Amino acid sequence: FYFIEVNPRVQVEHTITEMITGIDIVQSQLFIADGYALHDQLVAIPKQEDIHIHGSAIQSRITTEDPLNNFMPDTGRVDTYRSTGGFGVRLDAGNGFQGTVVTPFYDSLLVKLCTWGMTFEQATRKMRRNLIEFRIRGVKTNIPFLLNVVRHPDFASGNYNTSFIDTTPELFKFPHIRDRGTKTLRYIGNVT
Amino acid sequence: KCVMNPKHIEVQILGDTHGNIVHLFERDCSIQRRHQKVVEVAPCNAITSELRNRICDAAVKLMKNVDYINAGTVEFLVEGDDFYFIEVNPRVQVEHTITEMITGIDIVQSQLFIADGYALHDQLVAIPKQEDIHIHGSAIQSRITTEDPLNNFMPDTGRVDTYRSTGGFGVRLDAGNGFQGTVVTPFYDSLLVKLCTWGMTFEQATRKMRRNLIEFRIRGVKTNIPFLLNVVRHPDFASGNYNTSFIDTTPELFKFPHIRDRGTKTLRYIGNVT
Amino acid sequence: MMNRIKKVLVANRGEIAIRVMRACTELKIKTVAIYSQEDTGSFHRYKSDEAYLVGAGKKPIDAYLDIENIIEIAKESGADAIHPGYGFLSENIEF
């Protein structure tokens, strides 16, 4: 193993570390900055030896990057936004709420979706369900791409590396949508 | 004999069709309003491990004795260091959520596996041996309903014009008829969403329940959130020492702050001139 | 992944119905919701692969206690199993 970088800050993907250790990282940042010690009873961070891994967690960032258009972030009003929940599901919203207007100036991120399980496989089943259960209308999202990744057997195996995506062109084939709902509405709209 | 100031404590069981039976520790459902559960907590932080283990072992014993299959719960009353059976719910319960959160075990997935003939400890089912099933942290569940506390807990009805929920670390949501645009009817339960929070300690889980309850925006109907907040902020709750009578004998819990509805009034004005 | 449960009828409504459906989907099991007339717009009905009106003509609580109609629907849909959630028929011997 070889060092490459330090990020002297909280990161996007802190969420999954919270999920597998139990430690609220952002609360911990605040306590620390107020002068407390890690192991003060209020801060409740255990000694290194008493910090354990509990299960496995995966994070998927749901953005308006359109996979059918070169991952260009789509923009506009999110007319439908409906998220998911249940056991092992964590959601950290960005500009994803029903009625929001995605602009082109900042990141596209709508919501970070995280799932947890006692095993990676259990967490993987949940990521799949949750990704599919999301309804987001009015803009395109990267969900079709996330699903491809998460369903791919290389992903399920746990053996992938830096080059996985770039060398797996199946991940860029998407089902054609049957948007039977939308078409039906056009008809009803037209006759009306 | 009408036991005095008990803790209502429930143990979660799972059995398979191969004689394996396992408990997922207990839940404290002492917080009740006129004998109906309001807030549930797991594990029960006001009992010794020693007593926790006697209660769980008792539950397991009873269910082994009858060869119980699938999910079930054994209810006890607890007075000091004594415990008394009262009931078995031979079914999943509303408050299974918190037990999932402190053990890691998906109870509803476990019911499906079991009914399909698998064993608890099949690799796919992944339930550990009793000795390897542990408590991780503490979890609280609040059920958010349209029961209006200012009107005798009568369920309100109508269209939910605004429904916005919450999230972040340690938050679980299980929706009922809570979604933006839904029409709550008077025929069934009022339940909009079950809100659950988890922390490494009960105190950590309590801070989150408070934030999340406050962060919810629900407009178009009344909810019981003002009441849940009162419960969750009361120092008897924070202490972990409450019992069956807590709510019924704590009349502060029924005093509510005045709504700030500056928004709504401003809109009436704008509406009127327009 | 499952053995013989390929499809599940969730004989309930509301929160627990949705809970069961999610578990089913995670296990690659197909789901069937049922809903009374009065719950035609209930959002549990939107979370299943399939959905059917149950208890036509009956009062609202009775609609989800209609054993015969529930069974008809299970059979007609090819459900291998029925999850009764809690309340309603979950503790009913006859069912």
Contact B167, B195 (CB under 8 A): no
CA pair distance B159, B273, nearest whole angstrom: 26
Please provide the DSSP assignment of C47-83 as one string. Answer: SSSEEEE-STTS-HHHHTT-HHHHHHHHHHHT-SEEE
CB C19 within 8 A of CB C31: no
Cα B240 to Cα B7, B118, B179, B209, B249: the distances in Å are: 11, 38, 33, 15, 16
At CB < 8 Å, which residues of chain B contact C? 89-94, 106, 108-109, 111-113, 115-118, 124, 174-177, 179, 182-183, 185, 187-189, 191, 193-194
Residue pair B10/B75 in contact by the 8 Å Cβ criterion: yes
- What is the rounded end-to-end Cα distance, in angstroms, of chain B? 67
Interatomic CA distance for residues B75 and B177, integer angstroms: 28
Rounded-to-integer distance, Cα C81 and Cα C31, Å: 10
Comparing alpha-carbon positions, the chain C residue that sits nearest to A84 is: C22
Using CA coordinates, name the residue in chain B closest to A17.
Answer: B169
Chain C nearest C-alpha distance from B209 (Å): 19
Q: For the domain that residue A88 is a member of, what is the CATH number?
A: 3.30.470.20
Coil, strand or helix at B250: coil
CA distance A132 to A175: 13
Say if the Cβ atoms of C25 and A126 lie within 8 Å. Answer: no
B265 belongs to the catalytic site? no
Pick among B94, B109, B116, B174 to test the C interface (most C CBs inside 10 A): B116
Concatenate the DSSP letters of all residues of chain A into one string.
--------S--TTHHHHHHHH---HHHHHHHHHTT--TTSTTT-PPPGGG----SEEEEEEE--EEGGGTTEEP-EE-SEEE---STTEEEEESS-STT-EE-SSS----EEEEEEESSHHHHHHHHHHHHHH-EEESS--SHHHHHHHHHSHHHHHT---TTTTTT-GGGG--PPP--HHHHHHHHHHHH-
Query: Tokens at residue B209, please?
Result: 């329940």
Q: CB of B75 within 8 A of CB of B89?
A: yes
* Residue B59, helix vs strand vs coil: helix
Q: Which three-class secondary structure state does DSSP give residue C37?
A: helix
Q: Assess contact for A84 and A134: CB atoms under 8 A.
A: yes
Domain that holds residue A152: 1-176
Q: What's the angle, vertex CA B21, arms to CA B20 and CA B27, rounded to 5?
A: 160
The C-alpha atoms of residue A125 and residue B125 are separated, in whole angstroms, by 13
- Residue A154, C-beta contacts closer than 8 angstroms, at least 6 positions apart: A160, A164, A168
Cα–Cα–Cα angle for B131, B134, B138, rounded to 5 degrees: 160
Which helix (H) or strand (E) is B28 found in, with range? strand B21-33
By C-alpha distance, the chain A residue nearest B163 is: A98
* Contact residues, chain B, for C58 at CB < 8 Å: none
Residue B254: other Cβ atoms inside 10 A = 13
Strands B193-199 and B138-144: antiparallel
Query: d(Cα B21, Cα B27) in Å, to the nearest integer?
Result: 18
What SS3 class is residue B164? Answer: strand
Tell me the shortest Cα–Cα distance from C94 to chain A, in angstroms.
Answer: 31
Neighbours of chain B (3+ CB pairs under 8 A): A, C
Residue B9 near residue B82 (C-beta atoms within 8 A) = no
Chains that touch A (3 or more CB pairs under 8 A): B, C
Nearest residue on chain B to A80, alpha-carbon basis: B180
Measured CA to CA, the distance from residue A169 to residue A108 in angstroms comes to 24
Answer whether B127's CB lies under 8 Å from B22's CB: yes
Tell me which residues of A are annotated as active site: 9
CB–CB contact A85 B173 (8 Å): yes
CA–CA gap between residue A64 and residue A141 (Å, rounded): 4
Contacts of A19 in chain B (CB under 8 A): 169
Distance from CA of C12 to the nearest CA of B (A): 11
| Contacts for B204-211: CB closer than 8 Å, 24+ residues apart | B204/A24, B204/A44, B204/B137, B204/B138, B204/B170, B205/B137, B205/B138, B205/B139, B205/B140, B205/B170, B206/B140, B206/B232, B206/B237, B206/B238, B208/B169, B208/B170, B208/B171, B209/B140, B209/B142, B211/B166
CA-to-CA distance for A148 and B116, rounded, in angstroms? 29
User: If you count residue pairs, one on B and one on C, with CB atoms under 8 Å apart, how many are there?
Assistant: 83
DSSP 3-state of B233: helix
Query: Are residues B204 and A44 in contact, defined by beta-carbon separation less than 8 angstroms?
Result: yes
Angstrom CA distances, B89 to B23, B96, B101, stand at 14, 12, 20
The structure was resolved experimentally with X-ray
The CB density around residue A156, as the number of other CB atoms within 10 Å, is 15
From the list A44, A93, A119, the residue facing B126 with the nearest CB is: A119
Cα angle vertex B10, ends B9, B13, to 5°?
155
Q: How many CA atoms lie less than 13 Å away from C62 in the CB half-sphere?
A: 5
The amino acid occupying position A72 is M
Query: Which stretches within B107-163 are classed as H helix?
Result: 107-115
Among B37, B194, B208, B222, the one annotated catalytic: B37
| Cis peptide upstream of residue B43 (ω within 30 degrees of 0) | yes
| Helix B225-233 × helix B202-215 angle, to 10° | 150
